[PDB]
Amino acid sequence: ALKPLKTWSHLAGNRRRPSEYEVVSTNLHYFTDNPERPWELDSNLPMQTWYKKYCFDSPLKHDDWNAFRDPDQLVYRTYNLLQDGQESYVQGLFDQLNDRGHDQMLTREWVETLARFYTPARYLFHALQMGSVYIHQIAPASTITNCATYETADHLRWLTHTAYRTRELANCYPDVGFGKRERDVWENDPAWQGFRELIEKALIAWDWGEAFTAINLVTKPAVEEALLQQLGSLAQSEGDTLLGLLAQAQKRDAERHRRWSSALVKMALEKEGNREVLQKWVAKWEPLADKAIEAYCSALPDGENAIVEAKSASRYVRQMMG
């Protein structure tokens, strides 16, 4: 007869009574159970083929991915406590700077900047959600997926702030087209084609390791440096305390994604080959990050310096993991 255990079977002899996190997160996926036929069906289905090609046959290899752990140890329950608090704080900023009519105190210049440089981010931001969402469902481990799961909602979070703020800007400045114009800008404004191209092409990198690099290691720090860092300090200097703050807030989210991305990279470098494998996708993609930063930051005030600060900061992300 099989004895009752202290914890889950797959977790025995850990020597640390397992955390709530290790309990609800680990070894969840099953399709990694039969690499030859991942899904309980004909082995030749298009989805079978997709998972074999893009998930199993990644040049980025480990022998136990389920050994991964999110440094923040995030679970559904504690993602919501974290985020409930952070949403109180921003919903509070919205509520109260409105109260003041903060939107009225901004200049005709600064306003024109916003419509060009801020509100179209709704597209870039949703695009990241798709890219981040896509990592979810091809990552080779339930803990990698979860990290991605939560990262994706933050992305949603940011789309929402940005959608909200637009309605309010459209409200305060009706003659500008706020909410109506962003697509066109996204699609046709030289400032935005650096980013659009980078993101359009990352969105079809199907291999999980290439997606994770393409999206998390290259694209995100570019978007984060250009749209949050640079448009952030400029907004603050230009009178916009709200966006100065709103952006600083979103960056706490971004810093958490950089943690779990760093963590996974730390994990991949335990195995020979991977540094190269990753340096190779970096070097494929980075050129587009630079192109993206360049076309966006130079349309800004103090263009040439924004381009330099951002490039070096985003590069820094990657240097700090090797």
Partner 1 sequence: SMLKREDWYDLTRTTNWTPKYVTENELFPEEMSGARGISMEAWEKYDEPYKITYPEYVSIQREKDSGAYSIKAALERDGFVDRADPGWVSTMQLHFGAAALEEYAASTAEARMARFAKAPGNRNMATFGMMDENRHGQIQLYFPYANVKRSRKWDWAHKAIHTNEWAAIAARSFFDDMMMTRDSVAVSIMLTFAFETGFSNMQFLGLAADAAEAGDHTFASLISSIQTDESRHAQQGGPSLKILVENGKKDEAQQMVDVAIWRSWKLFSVLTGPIMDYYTPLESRNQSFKEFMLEWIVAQFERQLLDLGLDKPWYWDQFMQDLDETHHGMHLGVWYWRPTVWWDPAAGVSPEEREWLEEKYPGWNDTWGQCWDVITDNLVNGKPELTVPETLPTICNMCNLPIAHTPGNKWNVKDYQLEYEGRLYHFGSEADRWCFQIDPERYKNHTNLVDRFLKGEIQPADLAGALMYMSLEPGVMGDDAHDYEWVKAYQ
Provide the binding-site residues for a second copy, judged by CB under 8 A: 85-86, 88-93, 96, 99-100, 241, 245, 248-249
In the list partner 1, a second copy, none, the entry touching 46 (Cβ below 5 to 8 angstroms by class) is partner 1
Binding-site member from 52, 59, 93, 130 for partner 1 (CB under 8 A) = 130
In the list a second copy, partner 1, none, the entry touching 316 (Cβ below 5 to 8 angstroms by class) is none
Which lies closer to a second copy via its Cβ, residue 32 or residue 241? 241
Which lies closer to partner 1 via its Cβ, residue 83 or residue 298? 83
Which lies closer to a second copy via its Cβ, residue 153 or residue 249? 249
Which residues make Cβ contacts (< 8 Å) with residue 164, sequence separation at least 6? Answer: 94
In the list a second copy, partner 1, none, the entry touching 100 (Cβ below 5 to 8 angstroms by class) is a second copy
Which residues make Cβ contacts (< 8 Å) with residue 287, sequence separation at least 6? Answer: none
Q: Is 42 in the site for partner 1 (CB under 8 A)?
A: yes
Distance CA 277, CA 265 (A): 11
Give 65's Cβ-side CA count (13 Å radius): 24
What letter represents residue 66's amino acid?
N
Which lies closer to a second copy via its Cβ, residue 154 or residue 286? 154
Q: Is 179 left (phi over 0), alpha (psi -120 to 50) or beta?
A: left
Which residues make Cβ contacts (< 8 Å) with residue 261, sequence separation at least 6? Answer: 212, 216, 217, 220
Binding-site member from 14, 17, 35, 47 for partner 1 (CB under 8 A) = 47
Q: Is 252 in the site for partner 1 (CB under 8 A)?
A: no
Other C-beta atoms lying within 10 Å of the C-beta of residue 180: 10
Which lies closer to a second copy via its Cβ, residue 78 or residue 241? 241
